[PDB]
Design a protein around this nucleic acid. Structure first.
Ligand SMILES: Nc1nc2c(ncn2[C@@H]2O[C@H](COP(=O)(O)CP(=O)(O)OP(=O)(O)O)[C@@H](O)[C@H]2O)c(=O)[nH]1
Ligand SMILES: [Mn+2]
Ligand SMILES: [Mn+2]
Ligand code: NA
Length: 320
DNA sequence: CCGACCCGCATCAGC
DNA sequence: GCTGATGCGA
DNA sequence: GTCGG
């Protein structure tokens, strides 16, 4: 329920705008109208009614009519049948395949996972992992596993250096009963915004997690960001836990809190809070919040909230 | 009528 | 080689 | 797509 009929239709319209139309802003517009209609409390019984809401303009209001009147969106119907667009859309679901490669692949007739597997040369490194773990990466990871996942990371990071500070942020920090990836925030004293008193700080952590057979594959690895694959150690004659995504960020200690607010999200919430900082006369990024002038001081997450006249929303409520 | 819409890493285009 | 643009995903 | 200059 919950105007679910509309919000699906919108969300579906959005995924076709990103993946097929490569119209990133129409995608955002649709998801937006969707997240708003989702908060509206009433059963929308009219396009005009929905048009009262912000984010709902005419076109979406037109579409709500066709939907409410026919239980169907003839555009969406056509799109779902369409071999080309159905494929470009599907392949996006492989990490490393955005809309741009999706369309290359379908142009050359590559349209399925089977077609991808027997085209391994035509896949860069990332897309080859994305295929190899296509299943696992769409599986949700239970909080019970998030915890097992947390222990290993905190345990191994301190084994490298007792001065590191590692914080699982993301859906996890928001109490969510299950999460998609493992987002992890990392800080060390040598790395500050002012200076980099030690190198390989991220590397060390990655190699250690890789030494203990926790991190199994790398998608992208820089000085300050890691994107990777990891796997709980299993038991004897027992099923192998699924392969899971993990993102590690090395934030300057001085900007720790601007990084927490950011890696905690949510993404809809983040753009919702960033878009309110601009109108309140501010710019908020994972490092700083600026007036764009000099770095405003920060020693709490709420500090950022008051700056834009926002009541502090406990991490559990930033699920927008 | 029209422009705006909230950064790190890999790969590629081009010099 | 190098820089800068683009894709992709946080 | 939607909104505001
Ligand atoms: N300002 C933005 N922040 C983002 C964006 N995408 C991700 N993030 C930030 O990173 C955080 C984690 O990235 P994820 O893609 O895994 C989204 P999240 O952790 O909230 O949920 P799950 O995937 O179900 O675990 C997210 O909460 C925030 C974005 O597009 N814009
Ligand atoms: Mn996450
Ligand atoms: Mn993530
Ligand atoms: Na993808």
């Amino acid at each position: 329920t919950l105007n679910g009929g509309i919000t699906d239709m919108l969300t579906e319209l959005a995924n076709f705008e990103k993946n097929v139309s490569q119209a990133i802003h129409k995608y955002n517009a649709y998801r937006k109208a969707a997240s708003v209609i989702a908060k509206y409390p009433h059963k929308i019984k009219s396009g005009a009614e929905a048009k009262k809401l912000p984010g709902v303009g005419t076109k979406i209001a037109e579409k709500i009519d066709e939907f409410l009147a026919t239980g169907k969106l003839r555009k969406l119907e056509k799109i779902r049948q369409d071999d080309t667009s159905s494929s470009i859309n599907f392949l996006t679901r492989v990490s490393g395949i955005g809309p741009s490669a999706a369309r290359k692949f379908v142009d050359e007739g590559i349209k399925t996972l089977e077609d991808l597997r027997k085209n391994e040369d035509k896949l860069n490194h990332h897309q080859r992992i994305g295929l190899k773990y296509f299943g696992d990466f769409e599986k949700r990871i239970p909080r019970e596993e998030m915890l097992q996942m947390q222990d290993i990371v905190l345990n191994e990071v301190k084994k490298v250096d007792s001065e590191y500070i590692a914080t699982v942020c993301g859906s996890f920090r928001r109490g969510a009963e299950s999460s998609g990836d493992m987002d992890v925030l990392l800080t060390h004293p040598s790395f500050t915004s002012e200076s980099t008193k030690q190198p390989k700080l991220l590397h060390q952590v990655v190699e250690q997690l890789q030494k203990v057979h926790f991190i199994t594959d790398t998608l992208s690895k820089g000085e300050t960001k890691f994107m990777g694959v990891c796997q709980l150690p299993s038991k004897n004659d027992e099923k192998e836990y699924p392969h899971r995504r993990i993102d590690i960020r090395l934030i300057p200690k001085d900007q720790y809190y601007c990084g927490v607010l950011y890696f905690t999200g949510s993404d809809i919430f983040n753009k919702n809070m960033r878009a309110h900082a601009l109108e309140k006369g501010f710019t908020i990024n994972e490092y700083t919040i600026r007036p764009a002038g000099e770095p405003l001081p920060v020693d709490s997450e709420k500090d950022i909230f008051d700056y834009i006249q926002w009541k502090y929303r406990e991490p559990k409520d930033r699920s927008e």
